[PDB]
Amino acid sequence: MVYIDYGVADSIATITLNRPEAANAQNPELLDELDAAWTRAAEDNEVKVIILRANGKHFSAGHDLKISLEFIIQHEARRYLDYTLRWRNVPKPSIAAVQGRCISGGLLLCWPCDLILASDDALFSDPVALMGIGGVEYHGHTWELGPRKAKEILFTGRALTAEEAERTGMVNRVVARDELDAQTRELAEQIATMPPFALRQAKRAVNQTLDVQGFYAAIQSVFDIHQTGHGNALSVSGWPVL
Template identity: 80%
Template sequence: MSHILYEVADKIATITLNRPEVANAQNAELLDQLDAAWTKAADDDEVAVIVLRGEGRHFSSGHDLKSGEKHQGKITLEQIYRAESRRYLEYSLRWRNIPKPSIAAVQGRCIAGGLLLVWPCDLIVASEDALFSDPVVTMGIGGVEYHGHTWELGPRKAKEILFTGRPLTAAEAEKTGMVNKVVPRDELDGSVRELAAHIAGMPPFALRQAKRAVNQTLDVQGFYAAIQSVFDTHQTGHGHALSVGGWPVLVKLDEMKTKVQ
């Protein structure tokens, strides 16, 4: 599993994104390996808490846009829909509903597809230099595939971040409730480990019940239906981009992500 590191110690499974040379950009292999790691942790009775982190300067620069360049001019909307429904929607929803507490440790940039990795986690701890952004409107699409924006940020802040493409600082994210705690960069791993160890000492069945209670309440409020419906709206953006200019990636966003790396 070259793109993902996995270890278990003291009832804590640590899953690490391991493509630091490209700011942990997510290609198909990384996402498939990541899903396998989540499943392994979920099935292991010795694991009480799951921690997700990224190796290197940045948590994740999002989807690896360069990995799709070979399909330019040949890809269809049906192919995009099939691939994204599996890796960008099904995976994220599955990670959200794994009946064990999960914590994301975020440093540096967390761009677009990076949000699809942290939003399914139950808790998020960020370093002071963390920046969260979804500049996908630059691509002619209304936002990433897993639309947690409104739920995580509230409607007005969600619109601001989508309309402008600007990054949300760790401090701003904490104010909205998206981030639980902000710590200095050199304390990130230690703080997350301490939090995970505390949670791991709680009764596992009670933790499972507590997580289900919160997730089910969000679903009753419309979370699951909204995520499914906005995913289809996202796909109309791809369809429009294909009809106007071919491969649905604009140079502006690609150049921005290259600078981050």
């Protein structure tokens, strides 16, 4: 793998975004590698916990940017919707460690994790409105932030600090930048002492509550609204964005 580093030790799989030269901007190849890494961790009976982390200053700058809407949907449904939900549902605990900028598409990498630790310098945003689109393809915003804060960041394009995100429940813990990796691995190690079936079913309990609340249906619903963004952009310019 060119863009993703994978290691297993002490029952923990660590998946590292390794394209620091582009601020971990996501091309298709990177997303395919990342999905392969998640599947590896899912299928390795030695792995009890997964860490998602990133090299460099910034967790991820987002997606690396006649075209039909049909074509756009085919590609986005696979890599931005189905991959993300598949990661969400992997039956073992996962923790994202987020430093620096996590922008638009970056949210699709950390939101599917169960827990999020952020460094004090982390900044979460989704400014895709500038491009004519109503938020990224997988709409965690309302669930993670509450509707008022979700609209605030979509409408203004501003960034939320790590402490703001912690206040909405999107981030579990804010930690000093130099301690982010250490504190993440220590959490993962504590979780790995639990019986794997108990962790599987705890995760299932919370995620199934969310799905009964309408999470799956809402994610699908908003994916369609997202696609009208692209449809409008195409109708106006012939390009997927404004």
